[PDB]
Design a protein around this ligand. Structure first.
Ligand code: ZN
Length: 46
């Protein structure tokens, strides 16, 4: 279909890696676990 029903309204907890959003703090931490493994390319790079 063509009905993009997003689910982002009250999410005071957003991931500082990708940009996800969660209702509670833990709800976010559990996600960050996926990023855990290697550091991205920030400083000293493009
Ligand atoms: Zn993330």
């Amino acid at each position: 279909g063509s009905s993009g029903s997003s689910g982002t309204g009250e999410n005071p907890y957003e991931c500082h890696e990708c940009g996800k959003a969660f209702s509670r703090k833990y709800q976010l931490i559990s996600h960050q676990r996926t990023h855990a493994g290697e550091k991205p390319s920030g400083p000293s790079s493009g």
